[PDB]
Amino acid sequence: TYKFVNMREPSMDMKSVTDRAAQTLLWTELVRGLGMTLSYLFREPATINYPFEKGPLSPRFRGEHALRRYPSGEERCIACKLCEAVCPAQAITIEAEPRADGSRRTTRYDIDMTKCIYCGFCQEACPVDAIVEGPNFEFSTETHEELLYNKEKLLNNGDKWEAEIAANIQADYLYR
Amino acid sequence: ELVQVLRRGLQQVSGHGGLRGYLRVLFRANDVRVGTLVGEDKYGNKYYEDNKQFFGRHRWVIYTTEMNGRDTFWDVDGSMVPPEWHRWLHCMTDDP
Amino acid sequence: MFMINILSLIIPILLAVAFLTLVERKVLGYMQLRKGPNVVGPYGLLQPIADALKLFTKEPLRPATSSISMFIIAPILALSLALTMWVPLPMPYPLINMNLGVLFMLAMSSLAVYSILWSGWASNSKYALIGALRAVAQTISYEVTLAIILLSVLLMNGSYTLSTLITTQEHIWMIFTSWPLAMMWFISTLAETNRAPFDLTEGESELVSGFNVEYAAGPFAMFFMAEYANIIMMNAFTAILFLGASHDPHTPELYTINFVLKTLALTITFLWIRASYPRFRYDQLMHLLWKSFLPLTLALCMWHISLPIMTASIPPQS
Amino acid sequence: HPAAHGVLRLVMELSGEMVRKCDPHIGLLHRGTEKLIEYKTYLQALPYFDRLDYVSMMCNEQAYSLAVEKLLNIQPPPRAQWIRVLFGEITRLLNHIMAVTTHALDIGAMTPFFWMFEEREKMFEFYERVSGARMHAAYIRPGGVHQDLPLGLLDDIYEFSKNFSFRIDELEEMLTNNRIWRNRTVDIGVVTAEDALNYGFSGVMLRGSGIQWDL
Amino acid sequence: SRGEYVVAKLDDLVNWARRSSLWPMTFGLACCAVEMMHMAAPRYDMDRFGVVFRASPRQSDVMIVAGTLTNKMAPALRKVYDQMPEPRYVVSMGSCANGGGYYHYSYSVVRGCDRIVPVDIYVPGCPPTAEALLYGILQLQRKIKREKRLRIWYRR
Amino acid sequence: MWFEILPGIAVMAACLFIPGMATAHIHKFTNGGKEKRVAHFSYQWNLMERDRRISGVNRYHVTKGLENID
Amino acid sequence: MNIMLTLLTNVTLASLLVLIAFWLPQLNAYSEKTSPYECGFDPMGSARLPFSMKFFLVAITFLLFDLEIALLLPLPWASQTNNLKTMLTMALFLLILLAASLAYEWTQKGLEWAE
Ligand SMILES: CCCCCCCCCCCCCCCCC[C@@H](O)O[C@H](CO[C@H](O)CCCCCCCCCCCCCCC)COP(=O)(O)OCC[N+](C)(C)C
Ligand SMILES: CCCCCCCCCCCCCCCCC[C@@H](O)O[C@H](CO[C@H](O)CCCCCCCCCCCCCCC)COP(=O)(O)OCC[N+](C)(C)C
Ligand SMILES: CCCCCCCC/C=C\CCCCCCCC(=O)O[C@H](COC(=O)CCCCCCC/C=C/CCCCCCCC)COP(=O)(O)OCCN
Ligand SMILES: CCCCCCCCCCC1=C(C)C(=O)C(OC)=C(OC)C1=O
Ligand code: SF4
Ligand code: SF4
Ligand code: SF4
């Protein structure tokens, strides 16, 4: 089922001919366009006062990565390396060994933030909610090297954003 | 209704703590609206809301003038917002 | 004391031009559901100063293939002519009182095109050459119609003296007698100042930057200053020509305020038109000027020659 | 070049301003995506299709998911299919806004772009609320969608859709009947139905010539 | 010292002028540019900060590399960077420009635009949100504010 | 908003006030305060030259009335 | 005398602005910065090559139509003559011939650009 967009014939009576001639000589549709712009002039603009006002986000927002802890302070990560296997950009590098107490923990956990595509597959693949994409998005640097995150940087990110991260996970975890 | 908007302007002048407060807010945030205070940081940022403004302008923060070590009277950025007020300010929650 | 008057004419025009850019950015923004500059100073009042300081502290470059003499000469000619074309305007008194001010203004307008032409040719780039040839085509399109419209309108004035236009429109605006020509005249001004929808010499979406693509920093700023000054000047000329303010010999400030307000209205109308319309193709501009504007202009010139003789309304001062 | 979309090198032979020959040089954005796909799993390969046509993300996601589901001989659940069609039409709205407004900007009408990009921002908010990404959602996957809709999303979509028609009306008031727009667009780039079929065209480039075809 | 005070004030003035009027080149490569187009959209309105796109490299101040840089395109990017008059700044936007991103291991992709041009700000994301890009430009403004060219000249 | 466009416009208006007003004042300051004479034709110039010659101070705008016919 | 002073002042101000723009900032000129611009690449040919004019006939006609302006400008003064009938006849005749020239070129496809 279809319709035509440009298949209408103008009427040839004297009234229509005079209307079209007056349109040509007096520029009525151009005045209509001017009126549309003038109408927009007196509308309230849609601009927000950044950085004092921020754009709306969601609990599902994928921002800066972070490594989480259990309420006791123990690391959630167990070096299963699922995030490394699933990473479409190979942005994660992991090395592990038994800890001094025999625990299964990482010794290297690096994310190349200039390789990352910020897809969130790593936090889907994680079985213990150890690695997350946080809500932060304002972390521009001045050198390339500052965007090569090691385990200390990610643990600091987790310790710094845990209050917001836990609330977002509490809001979202029943959809996952 | 012109006198009404003029009186609203004078009210915005008077509600910022005098002419000096009006000028401080004009040259610090390029805005002179007045809203109900929601709370304050331990760093000095004050958070205001106004539900009569459209979505995006209904929540805002007046940043502090002195964060951890630097003078932020003019040098402000969005990274100074702590995570809890970050969640409130970006409308990921309806609760301060 | 005459040099003081020259300076009091030229410096405020530049200041006005600088602020005009700010107004256009804000007017365009609010017509596009945004704000425009409102951060650099209160309401963006310091933005033009920042733009000027940035432009005049940046490095200018001489293209390796360019012809240096003409490359340097063209912006000087543009800005000097833009400044010169204000001296015969009665506001309500002119800095220079000429018997033939309209013809002088026409000649200086005709000379102003060569800044664009020589900048485009001396840049020695392909896009600049295309912009210069578009300028040639634009002049060929609009020149004769503009001149004949001026002649037909001034047939009711009695002379080419600009100040006489104040006496001619003492009781009624000339537009009420020549509103058709006025419309055409308005369009001609849009073509004369290379303004949208006839911004073809620059043509950003087609020629990157057109004739001034190779210009940077101060010379580019001078080209911008000249163009905006010409915009304000032509709108002031239109206001004097078609919307005659009543002049009090003992209170000339009333005339000055009226004239300035009318000029600002016409300039804001220019900005509105830029915000409202797409761009012509530069052959379509010539076809519009030669196949629609020229026949009506010739017929109306005939009618305006016959009209004062028919009604016994020939103006004085042979 | 403002009209070259950043990565097109159009070598043109001109006589005056009349175009004698157009030779498009492409590959300035060739990233070797198809070779990269051969080293990824199917789920790992999914996010490449977001970046294929980054004006219509979920439509490419849907095409890839349909291909993989056809090869797997499985069926997505009905609610996933309805969500797919809804977000595909939202994506079509985004793509057509971008196309029409950038076209008008190229001709010279720069105002409707700003009017319609606020609507684009609202649909980006819908994308982010459903997936957490404004553009590269990766939401549509072989088997269905990644997550269910959050509560209240349908109401906001209805609120946007009940007002989008007036924005279309304003754009049409600006462009459709303008004589400058018609002078710039009427009888420009005319292609016949037979030539369009033989040259491999599809979509509007077919339907503009009267060919009654929609997939 | 009077001279130190004078050069400090002049540095302040020139830095304010240069950071309050930042004109980026009309230059984008890939999906990131779309988000850049959303930074000029009414909601964020980059023009309100004094940021205006200009097509000519001679009339521009900032290079925003918004998209993947291929090997076929690198000479053109270097050419239009070289044709920018000084002072000039480069902002690398998105994972592809930062380090290659999703196509890092490709045969035809430059692994980061910093192999071709010096970079002042790196904006992470794939793509960064328009708000994140605005944060990047404001950080670049602060960095320009920290410049002391005339003080360095005076202390030579 | 739109009234936030008004301030810049006002500045422009003030600038555009300066030239004409200045001219008027200057025309009054250098012409005895009485609207600088216009001479488009040689008759007006001859009148001005006669005025200058009979002024007694080489200034056309110094007007001599009936008090000069003793 | 006054117009000469005004012209000298305007030209001097423009030249001083150019001098400031060229002598105040720091210049770093090298061969890549000063090369011609063709949006990413070296131009294939020269910009001094011939550039065809598709509106050449209209350009020539502009020369002839520009002198009708010279002939028609003294009309305000001509309107003050005693024999208004002769003056009106001559002015109308001149405009009629101009219109006939325009019509002749229009009907002979002289206003269409070369392909
Ligand atoms: C007369 C013709 C020749 C001279 C031509 C130029 C004329 C002088 C230029 C006019 C100067 C006015 C500019 C001052 C504006 C500063 C406003 C303020 O914002 O600056 C603050 C502090 O000021 C700056 O640090 C220094 C600028 C002041 C310049 C010093 C005065 C030197 C004047 C000397 C003039 C001599 C000219 C040459 C003589 C030969 C920093 O705040 P900022 O971070 O940005 O904003 C953050 C954005 N927020 C507000 C939204 C959060
Ligand atoms: C708004 C309109 C009004 C403006 C009014 C002012 C007009 C200004 C015109 C242009 C001046 C602005 C330029 C800034 C200062 C001038 C510096 C330059 O012109 O001269 C320098 C002087 O260099 C000379 O070659 C060496 C000096 C020796 C020659 C002088 C001759 C006489 C001096 C002998 C000593 C005894 C004193 C005699 C005088 C009383 C050359 O420096 P250079 O590096 O190339 O160029 C880059 C300049 N930078 C660094 C600022 C970017
Ligand atoms: C009893 C005897 C009385 C004497 C007779 C008086 C009656 C006169 C009746 C006719 C008057 C018509 C005047 C208008 C002249 C030109 C009109 C025209 O037809 O031109 C159009 C085109 O004109 C335009 O569209 C203009 C385009 C540029 C638009 C730029 C902005 C528009 C301006 C908006 C506001 C205008 C304000 C003007 C006055 C301002 C005050 C000075 C022709 O082009 P096309 O439609 O494409 O067709 C050509 C093939 N047939
Ligand atoms: C002035 C209104 C906003 C214009 C912003 C200019 C951005 C320039 C980037 C070039 C570009 C354009 C023009 C463009 O249209 C496009 O879409 C195909 C791109 O790919 C994302 C681009 O990279
Ligand atoms: S967000 Fe995606 S690309 Fe980034 S580390 Fe996680 S899985 Fe890898
Ligand atoms: S972050 Fe999670 S998925 Fe990755 S290695 Fe640690 S426990 Fe395994
Ligand atoms: S970083 Fe991501 S969004 Fe940006 S250009 Fe590369 S693939 Fe596209």
Please give the angle made by the CA atoms of G58, G62 and G66, to the nearest 5 degrees.
Answer: 170
Note whether E119 and E63 are within 8 A (CB). Answer: no
Test mutation, A54, A57, A169, chain B, max B CBs within 10 A: A54
> CB distance from G39 to chain D under 8 Å?
yes
Pairing of β D140-141 and β D144-145: antiparallel
Tokens of C308: 């004062």
E127 Ramachandran zone, left/alpha/beta (phi>0; psi -120 to 50): beta
Pairing of β A92-98 and β A104-112: antiparallel
Note whether E30 and D54 are within 8 A (CB). Answer: yes
Residue C41: closest CA among chain B residues belongs to which residue?
B27
**Nearest to A138, CA basis, from B4, G43, E146, B81:** B81
Mutation choice for ligand 7 from E38, E102, E104, E123, CB with most ligand atoms inside 8 A: E102
- The residue contributing the CA closest to ligand 4 atom 17 is D5
Is A4 marked as binding a ligand? no
Is A26 marked as binding a ligand? no
Question: Would you call G92 and C65 a contact, using CB atoms and an 8 Å cutoff?
Answer: no
The domain that contains G44 carries what CATH number? 1.20.58.1610
Q: How far apart are CA D52 and CA A15, in angstroms?
A: 54
Residue located via tokens 């012109």:
B2
Resolution in A: 2.6
Taking the domains of chain E in order of start, what are their residue ranges?
2-155
In the CATH scheme, what is the code of domain E2-155? 3.40.50.12280
**Residue A51: is the preceding peptide bond cis (ω within 30°)?**
yes
How much of chain G is helix, strand and coil, in % rounded to 5?
Answer: 60, 0, 40
Query: Does ligand 1 have an atom closer than 6 angstroms to the CB of E58?
Result: no
**Single-letter code of the amino acid located at G68:** E
Q: How far apart are CA D109 and CA E78, in angstroms?
A: 32
Residue G114 lies in a domain: no
Residues of C in contact with A36 (CB under 8 A): 276
Q: How far apart are CA D3 and CA D107, in angstroms?
A: 9
Per-residue DSSP letter, D177: T
Beta partners for A69?
A: A75
Q: At what angle do helices D42-52 and D57-72 cross, to 10 degrees?
A: 150
**Residues 6 or more apart in contact with residue C216 via CB below 8 angstroms:** C58, C59, C60, C61, E56, E58, E59, E85
Q: Count the residues in chain D.
A: 215
**Nearest to A51, CA basis, from D189, D13, B62, F50:** B62
Query: Does ligand 5 have an atom closer than 6 angstroms to the CB of A131?
Result: no
Tokens of E25: 């080149």
Find the domain containing G88 and state its range: 1-108
Note whether E93 and E126 are within 8 A (CB). Answer: no
**Closest listed ligand to the CA of E8:** 1
Q: What are phi and psi of C265, to 5 degrees?
A: -60, -45
Please give the angle made by the CA atoms of G88, G90 and G93, to the nearest 5 degrees.
Answer: 105
Out of E99, E114, E125, the one facing A112 most closely (by C-beta) is E99
Residue G39 CA: distances (Å) to CA of C127, E27, E75, E97: 10, 10, 11, 20
Q: How far apart are CA D105 and CA D3, in angstroms?
A: 9
Note whether B65 and A124 are within 8 A (CB). Answer: no
Q: How far apart are CA A165 and CA D66, in angstroms?
A: 34
Query: Does ligand 6 have an atom closer than 6 angstroms to the CB of A154?
Result: no
Pairing of β B36-40 and β A104-112: unpaired
Is A3 marked as binding a ligand? no
Number of domains in chain G: 1
**Residues 6 or more apart in contact with residue D146 via CB below 8 angstroms:** A124, D131, D138, D139, D140
Residue C46: closest CA among chain F residues belongs to which residue?
F8
- The residue contributing the CA closest to ligand 4 atom 6 is E26
Query: Does ligand 5 have an atom closer than 6 angstroms to the CB of A119?
Result: yes
Residues of G in contact with E82 (CB under 8 A): 30, 32-33, 35
In the CATH scheme, what is the code of domain A64-175? 3.30.70.3270
Question: Would you call B93 and A171 a contact, using CB atoms and an 8 Å cutoff?
Answer: yes
Query: Does ligand 3 have an atom closer than 6 angstroms to the CB of C181?
Result: no
| Distance (Å) from the alpha carbon of D176 to chain E's nearest alpha carbon | 23
Question: Would you call E70 and D33 a contact, using CB atoms and an 8 Å cutoff?
Answer: no
Note whether A90 and A129 are within 8 A (CB). Answer: no
Count CB-CB contacts under 10 A for residue D182.
Answer: 14
| Distance (Å) from the alpha carbon of B42 to chain A's nearest alpha carbon | 16
Residue A89 alpha carbon, nearest atom of ligand 5: 3
Residue A96 alpha carbon, nearest atom of ligand 6: 5
Residue C14 CB-half CA count within 13 A: 19
Test mutation, A140, A141, A149, chain E, max E CBs within 10 A: A140
Query: Does ligand 1 have an atom closer than 6 angstroms to the CB of E13?
Result: yes
**Single-letter code of the amino acid located at F62:** V
Experimental method: cryo-EM
Pairing of β E89-93 and β E121-123: parallel
Q: How far apart are CA C155 and CA G88, in angstroms?
A: 13
Q: How far apart are CA A166 and CA C62, in angstroms?
A: 59
> CB distance from A16 to chain E under 8 Å?
no
Residue D177: closest CA among chain C residues belongs to which residue?
C277
| Distance (Å) from the alpha carbon of D188 to chain C's nearest alpha carbon | 12
Tokens of A75: 């690391």
Residue G70 lies in a domain: yes
Mutation choice for ligand 5 from A122, A123, A153, A154, CB with most ligand atoms inside 8 A: A122
Question: Would you call B26 and C38 a contact, using CB atoms and an 8 Å cutoff?
Answer: no
Is E32 marked as binding a ligand? yes
| Distance (Å) from the alpha carbon of C179 to chain E's nearest alpha carbon | 38
Query: Does ligand 7 have an atom closer than 6 angstroms to the CB of E31?
Result: yes
Q: How far apart are CA C36 and CA E46, in angstroms?
A: 8
> CB distance from A21 to chain C under 8 Å?
no
Mutation choice for ligand 7 from E73, E93, E126, E129, CB with most ligand atoms inside 8 A: E126
Q: How far apart are CA A82 and CA A103, in angstroms?
A: 18
**Nearest to A118, CA basis, from A82, A64, A176:** A64
**Residues 6 or more apart in contact with residue E141 via CB below 8 angstroms:** E19, E20, E22
Note whether A168 and A102 are within 8 A (CB). Answer: no
Residue G113 lies in a domain: no
Tokens of E116: 């071709």
Residue A54 CB-half CA count within 13 A: 28
Dihedral sign for Cα atoms in the order D144, D145, D146, D149: negative
> CB distance from A147 to chain E under 8 Å?
yes
> CB distance from A48 to chain C under 8 Å?
no
Is A173 marked as binding a ligand? no
Q: How far apart are CA E121 and CA E130, in angstroms?
A: 15
Tokens of A60: 């599902």
Query: Does ligand 1 have an atom closer than 6 angstroms to the CB of E6?
Result: no
Out of C56, C143, C302, the one facing G92 most closely (by C-beta) is C302
